[PDB]
Amino acid sequence: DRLRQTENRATRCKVERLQLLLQQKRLRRKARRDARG
Amino acid sequence: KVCLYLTSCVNYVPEPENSALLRCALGVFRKFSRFPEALRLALMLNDMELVEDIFTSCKDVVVQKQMAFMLGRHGVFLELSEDVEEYEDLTEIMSNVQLNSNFLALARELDIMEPKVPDDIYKTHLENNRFGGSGSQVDSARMNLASSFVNGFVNAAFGQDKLLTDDGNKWLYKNKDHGMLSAAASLGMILLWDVDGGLTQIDKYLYSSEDYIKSGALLACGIVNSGVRNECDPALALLSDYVLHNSNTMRLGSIFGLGLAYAGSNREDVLTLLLPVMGDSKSSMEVAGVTALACGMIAVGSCNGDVTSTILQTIMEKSETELKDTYARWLPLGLGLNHLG
């Protein structure tokens, strides 16, 4: 139960970081298209 | 004839390239000469697409199928020092990523189709329990998994059934561990190609108290990335930590996301990631089989090291037995898949 709590906390901080990076890349992509149109 | 392929497919090559300058009707029909001749001609499509630079649009049509329509391949082969004209758009096309896929499918499914699809294909039999007396006789605990797969099957392209898989959620903690695994892939196979939005819908299951639900959420993360090369590598970055997690069943399935999301490319990092289970002489045969089914077709190429690992791991437990076809179910399938095609 302790191992799984440390594991799920490590996974969380990995997912929360990936979601931020995906959102930042998605915003950069969109900004290029919206500037071409 | 075989030797006549080896000259006719290379005799196609200079005709629309040297004489004509159509330079896009050839590359759609020059993947015939990818495999029978050599890998050099298989990459000279990328080479003479690189060295041809007449404006931008017509070559963009050529790389629109090198996107992900037959094989990405050179989808990480262009950038050198921001040298290729419109590099950033060519990479967004060949990666299949978001507005070149999800947007389109969304732009059809909201505007030409019905985005509800609430399992009515398995609810169109409204006239069958009145047929032949009465009903309510089947009490087997196998219809639930099949109905779960059916309703998670037709809800592709942003038909997210939140608070509808609660029967699946209660069946996660009840019975059918195989079915508990196969039900957690529903949300993954419901946001196919939505890499940016799909992770946020799967996240809620990655912290589950059930290994079946958590494994099915890892498989869902793999499924969402299938055929889409995202710059953030969210499949590799989430599945890596689970590949060597325990010796039991949860050991078995944990590789499979890397077996699916990274099967059309060739990178060494996932290969040496998935190699130690394949090369430790572990005697649990189904774990070895599913790892072989991943690792023998991560790269459908000419990787000799994976070939030697597969054959050694086979001759590591198959020899001293006279038993069933499970021995040949997955590992020689992967050894065939190494150079198949």
UniProtKB/Swiss-Prot annotation, chain A:
Compartment(s) where it occurs, according to its Swiss-Prot or TrEMBL record: Nucleus, Nucleolus; Nucleus; Cytoplasm, Cytosol
Main function: Facilitates the ubiquitin-independent proteasomal degradation of stimulus-induced transcription factors such as FOSB, EGR1, NR4A1, and IRF4 to the proteasome for degradation. Promotes also the degradation of other substrates such as CBX4. Plays a role in inhibiting the activity of glucokinase GCK and both glucose-induced and basal insulin secretion.
Signal peptide stretch: none
Residues of the full protein shown: 378 to 414 of 468
Annotated domain remarks: Contains three domains that function in concert to promote proteasomal degradation of bound substrates. Contains a ubiquitin-like domain (Ubl) toward its N-terminus that is necessary to promote substrate degradation. In the middle, two domains termed Catch1 and Catch2 are necessary and sufficient to interact with unstructured regions within substrates. The long C-terminal region associates with the proteasome.
Lineage, opening ranks: Eukaryota, Metazoa, Chordata, Craniata, Vertebrata
Organism: Homo sapiens
Domain of life, source organism: Eukaryota
Subunit-level organization: Interacts with GCK; the interaction occurs preferentially at low glucose levels. Interacts with the proteasome.
Protein name, as recorded: Midnolin
Gene assigned in the entry: MIDN
Swiss-Prot record, chain B:
Top-level taxon of the source organism: Eukaryota
Extent of the PC repeats: 182-215, 216-252, 253-287, 290-324
Protein name per the record: 26S proteasome non-ATPase regulatory subunit 2
N6-acetyllysine PTM sites in chain numbering: 324
Quaternary structure and interacting proteins, as annotated: Component of the 19S proteasome regulatory particle complex. The 26S proteasome consists of a 20S core particle (CP) and two 19S regulatory subunits (RP). The regulatory particle is made of a lid composed of 9 subunits, a base containing 6 ATPases and few additional components including PSMD2. Interacts with RPGRIP1L. Interacts with CRY1 in a KDM8-dependent manner.
Tissue/organ expression: Found in skeletal muscle, liver, heart, brain, kidney, pancreas, lung and placenta.
Annotated function: Component of the 26S proteasome, a multiprotein complex involved in the ATP-dependent degradation of ubiquitinated proteins. This complex plays a key role in the maintenance of protein homeostasis by removing misfolded or damaged proteins, which could impair cellular functions, and by removing proteins whose functions are no longer required. Therefore, the proteasome participates in numerous cellular processes, including cell cycle progression, apoptosis, or DNA damage repair.
Gene: PSMD2
Residues bearing PTM Phosphoserine: 134, 136
Entry's family note: Belongs to the proteasome subunit S2 family.
Residue numbers of the full-length protein present here: 228 to 568 of 908
